[PDB]
């Protein structure tokens, strides 16, 4: 599926909504066709690969056991309750699949708040015992680079992969194992509404003239002050981001944000 030449990537889907895979398809300069034809070798990816069934399982084994090595990109949390049965692929639990494959990777990237921290299915009461990759697989010494967000900015995945290929090492990581080059600043310190925040100029409701005028969304729940991400800087789809669309940040690159940041419209 690979050999020499382009670095092999094995992309795994655990408990996920496929929003992170879709985010990668929005890659811009480089675009996803350049990434899959020129930069990397995408050797397993259930959303877009041609093979299915046994043929797909074969492609995966071929990629994972390659003497050339592979990088694993992991989307989705790992359900661990009831011995992992809430999530299976090819009738193997996702916990077993990841336990077997990820220790063999040259590097692992957890892409997605679900993969990094457990995500939406880990929110209380977590019926499937979902865990982020490093939590689930700590005992196997897996230390994935965490690229958080729901979904993350694909700029952040490509930037991390390019760095890794250049330098042969992870970039500086924060205490949640996220690259500081992307997660080093709060959304809030980068926000265009910060002068209103400083002045105590808050929109009291979404229908208000203050909201129309672009006042700060803190009283409507904005979690920008407690969220690390590069959203106001890079934006999404080369054009917008939540506060510039008038809606508070919901904290989506932070661990446990479904429970920590809720109710989303209170601070």
């Amino acid at each position: 599926l690979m050999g020499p030449r382009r670095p092999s990537v094995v992309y795994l889907h655990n408990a996920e909504c496929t929003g992170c895979s879709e985010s990668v398809l929005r890659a811009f300069e480089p675009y996803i066709d350049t990434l899959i034809l020129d930069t990397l070798s995408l050797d397993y990816h259930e959303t877009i690969m041609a093979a299915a069934g046994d043929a797909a399982e074969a492609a995966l084994e071929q990629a994972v056991n390659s003497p050339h090595g592979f990088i694993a990109v992991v989307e989705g949390g790992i359900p661990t309750a009831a011995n992992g049965i809430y999530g299976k692929v090819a009738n193997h639990t996702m916990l077993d699949i990841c336990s077997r494959i990820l220790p063999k990777a040259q590097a692992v990237i957890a892409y997605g708040t679900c993969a990094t921290f457990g995500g939406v299915q880990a929110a209380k009461p977590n019926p499937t015992g979902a865990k982020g990759v490093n939590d689930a697989l700590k005992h196997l010494g897996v230390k994935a680079i965490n690229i958080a967000g729901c979904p993350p900015n694909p700029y952040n995945l490509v930037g991390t992969i390019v760095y890794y290929l250049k330098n042969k090492a992870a970039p500086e990581l924060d205490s949640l194992n996220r690259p500081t080059m992307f997660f080093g600043q709060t959304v809030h310190e980068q926000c265009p509404r910060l002068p209103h925040f400083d002045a105590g100029e808050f929109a009291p409701s979404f229908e208000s003239e203050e909201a129309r005028k672009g006042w700060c969304l803190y009283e409507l729940g904005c979690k920008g002050p407690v969220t690390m991400n590069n959203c106001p800087k890079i934006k999404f789809n080369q054009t917008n981001w939540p506060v510039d669309a008038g809606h508070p940040c919901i904290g989506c690159s932070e661990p446990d944000f479904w429970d920590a940041m809720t109710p989303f419209y209170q601070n």
Partner: protein
């Protein structure tokens, strides 16, 4: 050479989510089928007790392929529960983002999920690009030259000669395959358009972020309307309009012509993958409280009787669990829904999926583009009729041909073309409404302590409904009934096969090691397993 015995396809790739298909084959034709969804997350359990305003943020994470659709369904549901009538502009903006979602979703489905079932990418290397260019130029107003297609061929050649086939590794067409019919030149045209569609979809998705903050997972809806005051500006409207215009041109000039050339080459596929019953909820309202105000109207059809479309009665929905991994066997209306997981392994106690089995008046119902198109057609929808009739005339087939795998694939394109034109109509109405001096986008509302609500979306895969019971101002019950749950859920307690199971009966399988015919039918429903199970 004909095979008798089981075939298992696990994972089914080029879908969203985790699906296991099991069939029994006899003498080369499918005799029995099971649709097994193998991931559960339990979002309905997680929502209990929470603030109803928070539901749309959680339920949007049901699915990032059909992103936005669940935020819209939950927001419609909570809007309904609290009795708010959102401003006209909120309806326009929500509707426009949804139309843009359909275009993005269907273009990526045809090229990036479905087409590798029908296109041999490696045979494109043998093509004559000059011949190919003539063919491409004869099916579209867009002129393609030999040089254009040679660039694609040269890029592919370099990719293939590297030995690293990537996403094409072990593809069912490698080495040739008797069920793959296209000539090298048509393979080359489709492959060129596959690649082009990877960059076009960026633009299609960007249209949603212009008003909706970001894609995937938009962030502009609230109970009572939308938040995006910038969406009123001429600059943002123009930016949207330019992306829409480019997206529509790709639909009209690239996707539909490709769809017709492939369909003409696989006309035998009018003989497989039919279904009996159809349900659709309608979409693109003028009045948030009246489904019959939608540009596509709701309806129900049993046993292909399109002369007798039945009204949609939302109280006739029940979700079965007898063949699902939940407690017991009792079917429930979603305002009395239960989500009580209990795993028994594959076929343990005759249960084999994490999806519930929705039934309408006890019947299994196909939903999605074929339901929306056939029901609209039969309602006299003039745009759906004009496009459907042209497609059938081009293909030289009768309407009966639509009841098939090919027909459903064609219906996905028909709906894409119709919605792409209708987005322009909605955009003009939106512009006209602003010009009248209406700049309001959100209305005030109050949370009741006790209420019931339901929100209906016809999503790219069909009829989506979110159902809430509010108790003490919190979520007492929240149930999602999702289009893939209808189409790909398992059998019910009357043991009736679901639409996907039933549609697979009679599928020919030329080569059991490479069962592309099963994939063609399964993919034609555009399965979304994160959606179906949640």
């Amino acid at each position: 050479s004909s095979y008798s015995g089981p075939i298992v396809v696990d994972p089914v790739t080029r879908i969203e989510g985790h699906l296991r298909i099991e069939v029994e084959v006899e003498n080369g034709k499918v005799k029995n089928a099971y649709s097994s969804s193998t991931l559960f997350r339990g979002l309905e359990i997680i929502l209990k007790g929470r603030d109803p305003r928070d539901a749309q943020h959680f339920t949007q994470r049901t699915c990032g392929v059909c992103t936005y659709t669940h935020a819209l369904a939950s927001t419609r549901c909570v809007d309904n529960a609290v009795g708010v009538h959102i401003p006209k502009n909120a309806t326009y903006i929500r509707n426009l983002v949804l139309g843009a979602q359909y275009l993005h979703d269907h273009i990526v489905h045809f090229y990036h999920l479905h087409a590798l079932d029908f296109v041999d990418v490696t045979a494109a290397l043998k093509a004559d690009p000059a011949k190919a260019a003539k063919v491409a130029s004869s099916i579209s107003p867009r002129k393609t030259t030999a040089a254009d297609l040679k660039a694609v061929q040269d890029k592919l050649k370099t990719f293939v000669e590297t030995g690293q086939l990537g996403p094409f590794t072990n593809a069912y067409f490698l080495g040739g395959h008797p069920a793959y019919y296209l000539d090298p030149e048509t393979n080359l045209i489709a492959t060129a358009h596959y690649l082009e569609a990877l960059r076009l979809q960026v633009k299609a998705a960007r249209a949603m972020a212009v008003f909706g903050a970001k894609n995937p997972h938009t962030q502009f809806t609230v109970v009572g309307g939308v938040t995006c005051y910038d969406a009123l500006t001429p600059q943002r409207i123009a930016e949207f309009e330019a992306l829409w215009k480019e997206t529509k041109a790709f639909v009209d000039e690239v996707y539909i012509p490709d769809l017709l050339v492939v369909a003409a080459a696989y006309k035998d596929w009018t003989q497989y993958g039919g279904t009996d019953n159809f349900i659709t909820f309608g979409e693109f309202p003028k009045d948030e409280y009246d489904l019959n105000s939608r540009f596509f109207k709701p309806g129900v059809v049993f046993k292909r009787d399109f002369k007798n479309i039945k009204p949609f009665d939302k109280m006739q929905i029940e979700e079965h669990v007898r063949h699902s991994w939940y407690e017991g066997a009792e079917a429930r209306h979603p305002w009395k829904g239960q989500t009580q997981p209990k795993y028994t392994d594959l076929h343990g106690d005759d249960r084999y999926s994490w999806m519930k089995a929705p039934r309408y008046m006890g019947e299994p119902m196909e939903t999605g583009p074929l339901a929306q198109v056939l029901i609209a057609y039969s309602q006299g929808h003039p745009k759906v009729k004009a496009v459907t009739d042209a497609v059938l005339a081009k293909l030289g087939v009768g309407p009966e041909a639509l009841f098939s795998t090919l027909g459903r694939t064609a219906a996905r394109g028909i709906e894409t073309a119709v919605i792409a034109e209708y987005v322009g109509v909605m955009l003009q109405e939106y512009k006209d409404n602003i010009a009248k001096g209406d700049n309001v986008i959100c209305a005030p509302w109050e949370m009741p302590k006790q209420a019931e609500g339901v929100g209906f979306v016809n999503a790219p895969r069909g009829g989506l409904s979110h159902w809430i019971r509010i108790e003490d101002g919190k979520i007492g019950n929240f149930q999602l009934v999702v289009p893939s749950t209808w189409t790909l859920g398992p059998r019910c307690d009357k043991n009736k096969l679901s639409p996907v199971e039933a549609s697979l009966i009679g599928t020919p399988v030329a080569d059991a090691k490479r069962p592309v015919e099963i994939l063609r039918t399964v993919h034609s429903f555009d399965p979304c397993i994160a959606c179906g199970v949640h």
